[PDB]
Design a protein around this nucleic acid. Structure first.
Ligand SMILES: [Mg+2]
Ligand SMILES: [Mg+2]
Ligand SMILES: [Mg+2]
Ligand SMILES: [Mg+2]
Ligand SMILES: [Mg+2]
Ligand SMILES: [Mg+2]
Ligand SMILES: [Mg+2]
Ligand SMILES: [Mg+2]
Ligand SMILES: [Mg+2]
Ligand SMILES: [Mg+2]
Ligand SMILES: [Mg+2]
Ligand SMILES: [Mg+2]
Ligand SMILES: [Mg+2]
Ligand SMILES: [Mg+2]
Ligand SMILES: [Mg+2]
Ligand SMILES: [Mg+2]
Ligand SMILES: [Mg+2]
Ligand SMILES: [Mg+2]
Ligand SMILES: [Mg+2]
Ligand SMILES: [Mg+2]
Ligand SMILES: [Mg+2]
Ligand SMILES: [Mg+2]
Ligand SMILES: [Mg+2]
Ligand SMILES: [Mg+2]
Ligand SMILES: [Mg+2]
Ligand SMILES: [Mg+2]
Ligand SMILES: [Mg+2]
Ligand SMILES: [Mg+2]
Ligand SMILES: [Mg+2]
Ligand SMILES: [Mg+2]
Ligand SMILES: [Mg+2]
Ligand SMILES: [Mg+2]
Ligand SMILES: [Mg+2]
Ligand SMILES: [Mg+2]
Ligand SMILES: [Mg+2]
Ligand SMILES: [Mg+2]
Ligand SMILES: [Mg+2]
Ligand SMILES: [Mg+2]
Ligand SMILES: [Mg+2]
Ligand SMILES: [Mg+2]
Ligand SMILES: [Mg+2]
Ligand SMILES: [Mg+2]
Ligand SMILES: [Mg+2]
Ligand SMILES: [Mg+2]
Ligand SMILES: [Mg+2]
Ligand SMILES: [Mg+2]
Ligand SMILES: [Mg+2]
Ligand SMILES: [Mg+2]
Ligand SMILES: [Mg+2]
Ligand SMILES: [Zn+2]
Lengths: 60, 127, 97, 23, 83, 206, 97
RNA sequence: CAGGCCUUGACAUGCUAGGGAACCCGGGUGAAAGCCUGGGGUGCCCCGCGAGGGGAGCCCUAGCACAGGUGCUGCAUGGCCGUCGUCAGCUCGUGCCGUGAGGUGUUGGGUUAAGUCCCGCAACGAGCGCAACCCCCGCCGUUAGUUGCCAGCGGUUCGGCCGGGCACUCUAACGGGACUGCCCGCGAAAGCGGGAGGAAGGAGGGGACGACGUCUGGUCAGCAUGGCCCUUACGGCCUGGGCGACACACGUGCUACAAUGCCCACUACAAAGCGAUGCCACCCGGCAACGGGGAGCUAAUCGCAAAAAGGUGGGCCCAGUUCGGAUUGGGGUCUGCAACCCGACCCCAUGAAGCCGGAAUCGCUAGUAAUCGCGGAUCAGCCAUGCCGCGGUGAAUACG
């Protein structure tokens, strides 16, 4: 049960609470950042390829 | 006329202004002994001029920002040691051997992932 | 006390008691068996019986495998005995000047 | 100590306010 | 507990079948999944079946169980001890 | 598994982002999603032209998609027949003024994304994986590179036991930040499963 | 007569603050130099691994750099060649008064 | 998990027809989903003063291909990660030695954090690692001067508030700076010890960075993917329950057992972040959580904001207590459709165990440990005492 779950998260819900975020890239339900709309795994995948504008590896 | 040094320590930045006078010292709109009231470490902030005898010879205008009291205190020590050298270049010797001229680079080490603090490691059962 | 984990596998309370009775061979050496932990598992060729035990003189770690689950259990105890008897007597070797 | 809600230190620990830590 | 500014919550679909029974000479047994509904005084004296996830439990409402929820009286976990 | 992405390790020092534009907190995710939708279609369609990179710019409700490729004509077509065709299927998605440029690749055998793809194609064609890898390295070095290393992992030849196969020539200093190293990945999809192809190309230091 | 510039890369940001300071400077008259506002840092810390391995992370940042310029002595002669402003793609300009 | 439901299906590309496009507000039944419905107007290009005919941009009804599966296999796999280990190792080319596996180099003497460098040598070179190139911090400079700052001058309604200025602090971009470069001494050399200068000294402190490989390591449940298995069901929707159970057992943590302490009142001193159905000043109501007003801020401007330890003053007087704050009764607040299972917070009352912990065992070498608070991601709310960060105060010891 994932594809139906990916579609049911898009569908506006019968109540405002039932809304939750998924990963727009892989459908992952957990650890979804709202800034990117991505999960932690896709966040690191796109950032490593340079396809996140501005996002760079941070060291200090 | 007026003499200035820049003093920094940890996260404190102190700007000190040495004008000749009887000895009065004011830190951020307060008397010295009122700003550091009840702090034992304070007197160390005046040590550079006790080393070049300018203890009562100067008045002190001092601003202070950032960090905490003792960091601000050590910042003063560098600041007024900075000012006395521009006040007189030969004040370096018999002030530099007292270390008062160097800037203390020891600062908070960054917290790292996997640890609880900078180095404190999580407990585990190897058994 | 002694803990038993059946990873990705179901066992009975009888099986767990057999394990406790088999680990009881280690009581021979009269040393504290501290929080002993057995892990029974199933691999494509047979069963794996893991164990980690701490004693006052060191730790015991050993793994036993065999098609028959009880044999893998027994092979584990054999490997654990040889380690315990090494922990209990190795210090006696460097005794003479 | 910190675990006592009815004290100032307890309300600081929880990040809350009330009669024993006003705002 | 729920804010007093808000109302005493009943699922409205359960409240309705209460009054139709009241206004006609009750009672029939009420089956419901409204564990969240409060036991308002109009319910006092009825016997209502509460779904616990498996069974609808017949719960006879009395006078002293009013400021409560229906779930409190059809517990969900079967437990009889250990050993 | 322990190696950092050699491109991501060099963003801002030897490599520039594939999507250059500012955006604010309420906008970033929406543009970014469009950027990946743009790449999702374009990478499927322009595969056969030798798609090595897709730069993307954004200013004010418009976007300037650059395409780096080895066969520019396969993208353009007859006088611009497919190039104009694209800008329509493109602006249908973008919903705005999606200008599309094309730029050729100097040497398609000094571009790691292409070298990896060529090996991945040779693998799906059931070529000697070990030989093919030595070929790619030999082609990149003959094309003048200062170092090259290709990796292929998985059921090579169909074997039940997966295996990794690699070859290298010259210098490939992945710890060196100032070394210009191009990295590309390609997915050989076979009847027995998936293999992964990683090409490293060393174009000199800076 | 205010212009503030925001961008993710500071190399393009500073160049795009020079080609404004330089622009209306000679174009008459006064230009208050590019003042770097403090940078807003937006941090991203994730587990390197797709599954467990909780004690291994990788840090990412997204820095939103800021610049301010005051074209002090306006003169709508300047308010023209600024209408055709060749600024790179990475930066965003605001004009207020 | 239980029950109530749906069968090209919540979703893709299709081909064929009925209606009509599409759509919007409702009616009934039901827990809801569903089932049953009741209304109402499709451009185009079309013969159109005319019934009438399409077609196709889109949905609804029937098919048949197909969808769908977080069903199995990490022992068929890609990807990414953990680990040994930031340990200094792992190899190749040619030559030499050996019937051959293989050796040599890479060993050796010296040196280094280092296969680091020096000298030697049937070896001579090369690669992957080491280091460096990158980030933060520490000193100074240049460019900048607001929303940041205030040295002096003028006002000053008592506020850098205004005038004024960019000095200073700062903020943030670019530079300089440290190289055993200089001196003394040992040394063949590489280096080692000591000295000065210097903000910094011998990698300046921390970061990012992880070789050939290992663990048939981890993940088919993030994703991908071979193969196998399900097809009114192992697919899909709903409502409710469960994931929070509790004779027990282990791992990680929080708060403690008190006087270097606890409580109350007053008063200081940060950093990094976040913030337009957001952050909320200030006023009013409430003991309070909070509520009602309401300014400011697309935010170096307004706000979260008070930092806490500390400092001052007062109480407690060694008691299971003014230590500790578990447990429970009662009364409220707020979010949310909904706090029974199963939320956080406030208030009254209750006030447990615990008097420093057996066998055993963990962390830490300096701004570290210890201790003190602050912020963020996730997020309606929150079960965070977690995690990732930030500064305050600031040790002990290393013979070996
Ligand atoms: Mg299902
Ligand atoms: Mg799927
Ligand atoms: Mg939610
Ligand atoms: Mg989510
Ligand atoms: Mg700073
Ligand atoms: Mg004093
Ligand atoms: Mg700290
Ligand atoms: Mg662990
Ligand atoms: Mg057990
Ligand atoms: Mg035996
Ligand atoms: Mg404490
Ligand atoms: Mg108390
Ligand atoms: Mg942990
Ligand atoms: Mg594996
Ligand atoms: Mg794997
Ligand atoms: Mg497994
Ligand atoms: Mg395995
Ligand atoms: Mg021989
Ligand atoms: Mg050999
Ligand atoms: Mg050889
Ligand atoms: Mg070797
Ligand atoms: Mg060897
Ligand atoms: Mg040696
Ligand atoms: Mg080393
Ligand atoms: Mg040699
Ligand atoms: Mg080397
Ligand atoms: Mg200046
Ligand atoms: Mg030395
Ligand atoms: Mg390195
Ligand atoms: Mg999968
Ligand atoms: Mg599979
Ligand atoms: Mg087959
Ligand atoms: Mg549901
Ligand atoms: Mg539940
Ligand atoms: Mg759980
Ligand atoms: Mg037990
Ligand atoms: Mg805890
Ligand atoms: Mg503690
Ligand atoms: Mg006592
Ligand atoms: Mg008592
Ligand atoms: Mg007692
Ligand atoms: Mg008490
Ligand atoms: Mg209560
Ligand atoms: Mg609840
Ligand atoms: Mg204590
Ligand atoms: Mg002991
Ligand atoms: Mg150490
Ligand atoms: Mg906190
Ligand atoms: Mg929340
Ligand atoms: Zn994802």
């Amino acid at each position: 049960a994932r594809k139906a779950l990916i579609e049911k998260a898009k569908r506006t819900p019968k109540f405002k609470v039932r809304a939750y975020t998924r990963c727009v890239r892989c459908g992952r339900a957990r650890s979804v950042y709202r800034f990117f709309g991505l999960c932690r795994i896709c966040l690191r995948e796109l950032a490593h390829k340079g396809q996140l504008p501005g996002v760079r590896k941070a060291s200090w | 006329e007026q003499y200035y040094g820049t003093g920094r320590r940890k996260e404190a930045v102190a700007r000190v202004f040495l004008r000749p006078g009887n000895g009065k010292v004011t830190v951020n709109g307060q008397d010295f002994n009122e700003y550091f009231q009840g702090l034992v470490r304070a007197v160390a902030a005046l040590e550079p001029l006790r080393a070049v005898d300018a203890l009562g010879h100067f008045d002190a205008y001092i601003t202070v920002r950032g960090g905490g009291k003792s960091g601000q205190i050590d910042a003063i020590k560098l600041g007024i040691a900075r000012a006395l050298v521009q006040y007189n270049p030969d004040y370096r010797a018999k002030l530099k051997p007292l270390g008062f001229l160097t800037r203390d680079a020891r600062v908070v080490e960054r917290k790292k992932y996997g640890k609880h603090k900078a180095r404190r490691a999580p407990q585990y059962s190897k058994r | 006390t002694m803990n038993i984990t059946s990873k990705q596998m179901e066992i009975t309370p009888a099986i767990r008691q057999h394990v406790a009775d088999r680990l009881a061979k280690l009581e021979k050496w009269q040393t504290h068996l501290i929080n002993p932990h057995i892990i029974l598992s199933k691999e494509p060729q047979g069963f794996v019986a893991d164990a980690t035990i701490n004693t006052p003189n060191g730790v015991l770690v050993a793994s036993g495998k065999h098609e028959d689950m009880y044999t893998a259990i027994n092979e584990l105890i054999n490997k654990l005995e040889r380690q315990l008897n090494k922990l209990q007597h190795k210090g006696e070797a460097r005794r003479a000047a | 100590g910190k675990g006592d809600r009815r004290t100032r230190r307890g309300k600081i620990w929880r990040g809350t306010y009330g009669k024993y830590r006003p705002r | 507990p729920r804010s007093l500014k808000k109302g005493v919550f009943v699922d409205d679909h359960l409240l309705e079948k209460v009054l139709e029974l009241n206004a006609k000479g009750e009672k029939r047994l009420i089956k419901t999944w409204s564990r969240r509904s409060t036991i308002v005084p109009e319910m006092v004296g009825h016997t209502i079946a509460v779904y616990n996830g498996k069974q609808h439990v017949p719960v006879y409402i009395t006078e002293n169980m009013v400021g409560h929820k229906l779930g409190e009286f059809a517990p969900t976990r079967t437990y009889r001890g250990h050993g | 598994g322990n190696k950092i992405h050699p491109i991501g390790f060099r963003l801002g020092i030897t490599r520039d982002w594939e999507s250059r534009w500012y955006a604010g907190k309420k906008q970033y995710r929406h543009l970014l999603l469009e950027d990946q939708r743009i790449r999702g279609l374009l990478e499927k369609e322009l595969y056969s032209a030798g798609l090595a990179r897709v730069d993307i710019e954004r200013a004010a409700d418009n976007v300037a998609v650059t395409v780096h490729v080895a066969k520019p004509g396969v993208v353009i077509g007859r006088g611009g027949e497919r190039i104009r065709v694209l800008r329509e299927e493109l602006a249908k998605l973008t919903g705005k003024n999606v200008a599309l440029n094309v730029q050729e690749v100097q040497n398609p055998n000094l571009s790691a994304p292409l070298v990896a793809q060529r090996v991945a194609e040779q693998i799906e064609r059931r070529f000697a994986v070990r030989r093919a890898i030595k070929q790619a390295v030999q082609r990149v070095m003959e094309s003048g590179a200062k170092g090259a290393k290709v990796i292929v992992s998985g059921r090579i030849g169909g074997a039940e036991q997966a295996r990794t196969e690699w070859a290298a020539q010259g210098r490939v200093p992945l710890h060196t930040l100032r070394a210009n190293i191009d990295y590309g990945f390609a997915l050989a999809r076979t009847t027995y499963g998936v293999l992964g192809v990683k090409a490293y190309i060393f174009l000199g230091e800076v | 007569i205010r212009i503030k510039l925001r961008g993710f890369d500071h190399k393009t940001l500073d160049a795009s603050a020079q080609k404004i300071v330089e622009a209306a400077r000679r174009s008459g008259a006064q230009v208050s130099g590019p003042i770097p506002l403090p940078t807003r840092v937006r941090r991203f810390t994730v587990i390197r691994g797709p599954f467990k391995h909780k004690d291994s992370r990788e840090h990412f940042e997204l820095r939103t750099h800021n610049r301010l310029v005051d074209i002090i002595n306006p003169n709508r002669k300047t308010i023209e060649q600024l209408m055709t402003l060749d600024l790179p793609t990475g930066v965003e300009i605001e004009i207020k008064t």
